[PDB]
């Protein structure tokens, strides 16, 4: 495992996040910590504008940290061997009853704490749907395939939101990652996975309050091949 001098086995973040959800405007901040080697991380969040929000939070849960990624097997650490500059990433998720969220993020490195800045944009969340309802119970955990495309990474996952009452709605999320480090001094990885686990903690008062942690390993597929892979 490389490790890069600024990234160390503790760190903090911050972040600031603005966006609009079927045309709901809202603001949240968070601060949070981590142990970036070991894969894991806490992030409190406070919606401090446009509260109550009307939407589950679930929605913005993946907006809230790729450094925190436990990279195994000599996987290339695209995140950790981009600082001090940093890195963006720009999603699409699609839900499955037709609800489309767009989130862009910056993350940076300001006096030894990371800095992440978010925009988030959802529309045609339906009014029925457990979303605008609040009828949601959590992500369950998710394999995330990425793989290097034109100097930066894309990333492919579906994830499975629990509902009240039981069942699942599906999204796909399609992210486009790019270091803010030029690429002669950047070590690529190949095709890779990420297996996921974000976890709600604890909650208060509509959801204006969130604790939420997460494990993330980046790993080859461990499975036999036939072909030396």
Same mark, same amino acid.
């Given at each position: 495992?490389?490790?890069?001098?600024?990234?160390?086995?503790?760190?903090?973040?911050?972040?600031?996040?603005?966006? #609009?959800?079927?045309?709901?405007? +809202?603001?949240?901040? !968070?601060?949070? =910590? /981590?142990?970036?080697? %070991?894969?894991?991380? *806490?992030?409190?969040?406070?919606?401090?504008?446009?509260?109550?929000?009307?939407?589950?939070?679930?929605?913005?849960?993946?907006?809230?940290?790729?450094?925190?990624?436990?990279? #195994?097997?000599?996987?290339?650490? +695209?995140?950790?061997? !981009?600082?001090? =500059? /940093?890195?963006?990433? %720009?999603?699409?998720? *699609?839900?499955?009853?037709?609800?489309?969220?767009?989130?862009?993020?910056?993350?940076?490195?300001?006096?030894?704490?990371?800095?992440?800045?978010?925009?988030?944009?959802?529309?045609?969340?339906?009014?029925?749907?457990?979303?605008?309802?609040?009828?949601?119970? /959590?992500?369950?955990?998710?394999?995330?395939?990425?793989?290097?495309?034109?100097?930066?990474?894309?990333?492919?996952?579906?994830?499975?939101?629990?509902?009240?009452?039981?069942?699942?709605?599906?999204?796909?999320?399609?992210?486009?990652?790019?270091?803010?480090?030029?690429?002669?001094?950047?070590?690529?990885? /190949?095709?890779?996975?990420?297996?996921?686990?974000?976890?709600?903690?604890?909650?208060?008062?509509?959801?204006?309050?969130?604790?939420?942690?997460?494990?993330?390993?980046?790993?080859?597929?461990?499975?036999?091949?036939?072909?030396?892979?």
């Amino acid at each position: 495992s490389m490790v890069s001098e600024l990234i160390k086995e503790n760190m903090h973040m911050k972040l600031y996040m603005e966006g #609009t959800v079927n045309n709901h405007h +809202f603001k949240c901040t !968070s601060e949070g =910590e /981590g142990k970036p080697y %070991e894969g894991t991380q *806490t992030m409190r969040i406070k919606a401090v504008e446009g509260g109550p929000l009307p939407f589950a939070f679930d929605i913005l849960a993946t907006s809230f940290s790729r450094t925190f990624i436990n990279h #195994t097997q000599g996987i290339p650490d +695209f995140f950790k061997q !981009s600082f001090p =500059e /940093g890195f963006t990433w %720009e999603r699409v998720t *699609t839900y499955e009853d037709g609800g489309v969220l767009t989130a862009t993020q910056d993350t940076s490195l300001q006096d030894g704490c990371l800095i992440y800045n978010v925009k988030i944009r959802g529309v045609n969340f339906p009014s029925n749907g457990p979303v605008m309802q609040k009828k949601t119970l /959590g992500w369950e955990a998710s394999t995330e395939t990425l793989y290097p495309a034109d100097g930066g990474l894309e990333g492919r996952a579906d994830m499975a939101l629990k509902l009240v009452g039981g069942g699942h709605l599906i999204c796909n999320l399609k992210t486009t990652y790019r270091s803010k480090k030029p690429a002669k001094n950047l070590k690529m990885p /190949g095709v890779y996975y990420v297996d996921h686990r974000l976890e709600r903690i604890k909650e208060a008062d509509k959801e204006t309050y969130v604790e939420q942690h997460e494990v993330a390993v980046a790993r080859y597929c461990d499975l036999p091949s036939k072909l030396g892979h």
